[model samples]
Target chain A: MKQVTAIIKPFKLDEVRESLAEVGVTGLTVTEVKGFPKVKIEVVVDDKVVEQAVDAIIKAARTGKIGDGKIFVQEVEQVIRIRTGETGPDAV
Target chain B: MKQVTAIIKPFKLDEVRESLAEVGVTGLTVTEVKGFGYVVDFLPKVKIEVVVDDKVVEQAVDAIIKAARTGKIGDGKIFVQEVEQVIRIRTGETGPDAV
Candidate 1:
């Protein structure tokens, strides 16, 4: 799985979330993050969806200026759903 | 080494911290989070981040689960990832010591 972390303007949360949902992303972890008081939205998705997910963020979070924030992609070695003990893609 | 990020219920912070302490996880970054409210519920969450040796990653995760579990929808999620580098600014430490 791939882990996508986007640091965006705080006010853009709703728009980014909506765009992601339109692409069938239902689960996300949003943190009140730093680095210019940005909101960090984290999502773990199947490898196939990584591009779509990144595109969604770049589209909605862009403000046509600096401090629109940044998006980072990394490999997630494992993910576990504590409630169901689901791992791998199933857990995601 | 690995970085474990756990998004858990707000109320479980203390319990989770204590549990993680038992497993030798000393430093962590905590953040307030949101979900569903703007998007089930607009519930408050705490995202806990810990960096540990690859060997103790599992133990740390287990501690989080054991303390954070509530058998409920928002008990939260835990993710493990590779950490390419880590540094401590004050002491100029790097690698595991920095972590």
Candidate 2:
């Protein structure tokens, strides 16, 4: 099975989802996240910013404003429906 | 290299992709993972994660955070790790050559 994980602009989630689904994919997991890239170097790192950074990371990629999030995907050897015990793609 | 992985609600994928693209990161990989995080147990949870280069970790996270949605239980987590290599099975490309 192929795992498809993508990180995109906030508003584009549905578009990406639809595209993938068109390729016959269904059922996936999503989460919120926060992160900082070294796009720019700041001589001073405020405690609040640092704290937010940690929160954004551990929390979701909010960046403390609006529209910052991410998604991840991994390969599955098998999937089982908890109640029925159906396995593989059917389980998903 | 670094790996960034996230497990989010089944929705909210495109937003994440566009955000990452906006940050000037073009190469990536994806997979469909079945995971069980510390969820409340009534529902099943799966995780989505990625392996990226160390320099691109921030951009990777930015893309994920921007696209993730909420309002349900067991929204996933994101993580990072150092990557030793990424290889293309068909082509046998390695390291920066994998994509």
Candidate 3:
């Protein structure tokens, strides 16, 4: 089993989730993240400067300013459940 | 490779990564994972999961313990599980070759 992490545009969350569900992903974990596109490097370094270039892309891709988007995926190791300790598809 | 998942304080991120690096692990994915403990209601903690060679499980666990041991209210837990297969998206390597 592999852990797949995709950093995608925010508004596409619904579509992404539905796509994953269709692919038989029963469970996933999601979290809001802020990242930049790494475009047009002006040789700047600092949180404020970095935030400027990155935040706009994240904001533009969102439905709103805050809670823009999230990262979601299952933690699979032989697809076992930590709570019930079941393995395989039943655990997932 | 075995994946070592540990729920630890966020401050220990650097130490954990450095320890894993010392064990000759060139690549790792660092995620800010929020998780809950069996303890009473509290702030969510971070989970740092590392995938390394099967031979390095003990060294990885030792590294995790050395990095995340606060022994306070939220020292958190560690879990090791078997990986049947793993692939790197960029390289297209499978299983042990993926790392």
lDDT of 3 by residue, B1-99 (tens): 777776556787788788777877546565565432345532455666677779887777666666666555456555566767888898899987786
Candidate that scores best on DockQ: 1
Better of 1 and 2 by lDDT: 1
Clashes of 1: 0
Best by lDDT: 1
Deviating ranges (above 4 Å) for candidate 1:
A33-37, A63-67, B37-40
Off by over 4 Å in 3: A1-92, B35-44
Shift of residue B23 alpha carbon in model 2, Å: 2.9
**Model 2 C-alpha lDDT per residue in residues A31-55, reported as the tens digit of each score:** 3333542111101122223333233
**What 10-residue stretch in candidate 3 chain B is worst by lDDT?**
B34-43
TM-score of chain B of each: 0.91, 0.65, 0.80
lDDT of 2 at B53: 59
Order of models, best lDDT first: 1, 3, 2
Worst 10 residues of 2 chain B by lDDT: B35-44
Instruction: Put down candidate 1 lDDT per residue, B1-99, tens digits, no spaces.
Output: 899998888889999999999999979898887756434456677788989988999899999999988787777789999988888899988898887
Model 2 deviation from the true structure expressed as Cα RMSD, one decimal place:
18.3
